[PDB]
Design a protein around this nucleic acid. Structure first.
Ligand SMILES: Nc1ncnc2c1ncn2[C@H]1C[C@H](O)[C@@H](COP(=O)(O)OP(=O)(O)OP(=O)(O)O)O1
Ligand SMILES: [Ca+2]
Ligand SMILES: [Ca+2]
Length: 341
DNA sequence: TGGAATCCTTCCCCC
DNA sequence: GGGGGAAGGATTC
């Protein structure tokens, strides 16, 4: 099996660059302004000229501004990047039918049939990078290996504007060599839990009683890691299905007054129902980010779909449960819909 | 900030 | 005991 993975370089900033080419060469910061004070919000992403000074996804816009007061700061336009995304995904379909769209900027391809080895794959690699650059003026990084996980690791190593092959000899090398934190699916919380068990490299996973692993990081993530370390990971490329739709918004001020929270909640419902587009959910969840940035949710599944009218009334009940059961103020409020007919 | 998948624990109903 | 589904969270990208 041969998997080819594509990650679109600094994606939101690059689209902004493409749509306004004068940006190129400058540091560009795509921001999610939250509207509480001037420059409240976070950075969605930044191009490389900004990242090399620490300006990156996650940091507050006020912090980015302190480091690069003269960078170019743009509000995020998700819809635009999304439409550009779709176009690029279409290009890749013309290279394989088996395609796993992982994110707005990530896709895996099963090119087992279309190619014979890591020479030919490298070429198809370049064919694709070039086609996407030609048709869309967008640079991407390509990772190629024996399974998804490694395909992605290859890309991470080779970015930006790279293309990289992790063969079999390297796979075996990285199983011993690679820091387990750099393995997809392993965040700060799992990486620290693995340190406490002495797992610092993928191979260490074999020096443990399976139940102690399951006991710590959970069963599924334990099997994941073990199969990887055993050169045995082999999950297939599959169409991912939209299972949930929603939208959460930031309120100007933290609050506990019901009538103060409702309009944000209603706006959240509205945007969500538009996004549904002929989809009909039987589940609603009201989600709230408390003032200490903790996340509380109350929900309900119906035996039928939910009309906009029903969602309005039910969301207020769930919002009321939340207030009744959590004493903190609400920072962010919103909804998810799920269990589509 | 923020969308959404996947997972995990718990509770519950009931053969 | 365990299938089976909900609910509320935890974790990740
Ligand atoms: N923490 C975040 N907050 C908001 N949006 C994000 C965040 N991280 C990523 N995104 C968005 C914007 C990104 O361009 C896009 C893809 O993320 P990602 O693949 O990790 O990096 P990137 O596209 O910005 O470039 P690169 O992979 O070269 O670092 O999704
Ligand atoms: Ca990318
Ligand atoms: Ca990591």
């Amino acid at each position: 099996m041969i998997v080819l993975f594509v990650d679109f370089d600094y994606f939101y900033a690059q689209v902004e660059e493409v749509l306004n080419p004068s940006l190129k060469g400058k540091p560009v910061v795509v921001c999610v302004f939250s509207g509480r004070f001037e420059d409240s919000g976070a950075v969605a992403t930044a191009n490389y000229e900004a990242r090399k000074f620490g300006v990156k996804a996650g940091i507050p816009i006020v912090e980015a501004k302190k480091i690069l007061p003269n960078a170019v700061y743009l509000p995020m336009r998700k819809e635009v990047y999304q439409q550009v995304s779709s176009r690029i995904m279409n290009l890749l379909r013309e290279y394989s039918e088996k395609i796993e769209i992982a994110s707005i900027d990530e896709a895996y391809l099963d090119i087992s049939d279309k190619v014979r080895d890591y020479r030919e794959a490298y070429n198809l690699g370049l064919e694709i990078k070039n086609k996407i650059l030609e048709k869309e003026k967008i640079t991407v990084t390509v990772g190629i290996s024996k399974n998804k996980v490694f395909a992605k690791i290859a890309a991470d190593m080779a970015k930006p504007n790279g293309i990289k092959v992790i063969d079999d000899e390297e796979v075996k090398r990285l199983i011993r060599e690679l820091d387990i934190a750099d393995v997809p699916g392993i965040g700060n919380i799992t990486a620290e839990k693995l340190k406490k068990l002495g797992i610092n490299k993928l191979v260490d996973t074999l020096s443990i009683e399976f139940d102690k692993l399951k006991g710590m990081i959970g069963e599924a993530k334990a099997k994941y890691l073990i199969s990887l370390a055993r050169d045995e990971y082999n999950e297939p490329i599959r169409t991912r299905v939209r299972k949930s739709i929603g939208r959460i918004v930031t309120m100007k001020r933290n609050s506990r007054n019901l009538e103060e929270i409702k309009p944000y909640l209603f706006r959240a419902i509205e945007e969500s129902y538009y996004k549904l587009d002929k989809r009909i959910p039987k589940a609603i969840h009201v989600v709230a980010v408390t003032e200490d940035l903790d996340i509380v949710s109350r929900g309900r599944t119906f035996p039928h779909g939910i009309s906009k009218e029903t969602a309005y009334s039910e969301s207020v009940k769930l919002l009321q449960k939340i207030l009744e059961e959590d004493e903190r103020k609400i920072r962010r409020i919103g909804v998810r819909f799920s269990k589509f007919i």
